[PDB]
Amino acid sequence: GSPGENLKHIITLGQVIHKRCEEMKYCKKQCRRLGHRVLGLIKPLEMLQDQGKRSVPSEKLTTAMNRFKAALEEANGEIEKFSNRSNICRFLTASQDKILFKDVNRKLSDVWKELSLLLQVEQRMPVSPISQGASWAQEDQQDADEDRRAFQMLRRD
Ligand SMILES: CC(C)c1ccc([C@H](O)c2nc3ccccc3[nH]2)cc1
């Protein structure tokens, strides 16, 4: 059917995670840029239902979007668990210098570029080159680093 809640939860997923960042205390550093940057992907997603221009999507879209729904959940879920200092410490100590929302940016873009194609094919929603350009990904590695040094003060040896 076509209740609408599906899209409502799919779109809001980007806002909830963005605002949720404020809740963070340690990962807030990366979450700030993550939620802010990623928000750009949902920006054009909400504009659709907001403006009310693009007609109802078809199965071809439902399939693609359906993948982004669960995919994006990874981010909202990660930040949730990461909220706990134990989750950040155990992870930070587990390895040496690593990202927390790396795969997220990958899956989010991979799932977006897939559903964005069948979307732009008729009408280009976004503006910037969402396809080409993997700079935002490298930037993440730099953000996660800030959490490391910032974590030092969090707890003294
Ligand atoms: C952002 C725009 C493009 C959008 C809006 C809703 C959905 C939702 O997943 C959806 N509901 C549907 C009902 C009937 C047939 C297809 C549907 N897709 C997917 C994408």
Residue-wise DSSP of 85-147: HHHHHHHHHHSSS--SSHHHHHHHHHHHHHHHHHHHTTS----S-SSS--HHHHHHHHHHHHH
In terms of Cα–Cα distance, which of 6, 25, 22 is closest to 64? 6
Q: What are the residue ranges spanned by the domains of the chain?
A: 1-157
For residue 73, give the nearest of 61, 84, 81, 85 by alpha carbon.
81
Ligand 1 centroid from CA 118, angstroms: 12
Distance 55 CA to ligand 1 centre (A): 9
Residue holding tokens 């799919």? 10
Nearest Cα to Cα of residue 48 among 61, 35, 60, 36:
61
Method: NMR
Helices 135-154 and 85-94 sit at what angle, rounded to 10 degrees? 110
Q: Take atom 15 of ligand 1 and give the residue whose Cα is closest.
A: 58
List all residues whose CB is within 6 A of at least one atom of ligand 1: 2, 6-7, 45, 48, 56-59, 61-62, 65, 119
**Which residue's CA is the nearest one to ligand 1's atom 1?**
45
Rounded distance, CA 97 to CA 94, Å? 10
Nearest CA to ligand 1 atom 6: 7
Under a CB-based contact definition with an 8 Å cutoff, are residues 68 and 10 in contact? yes
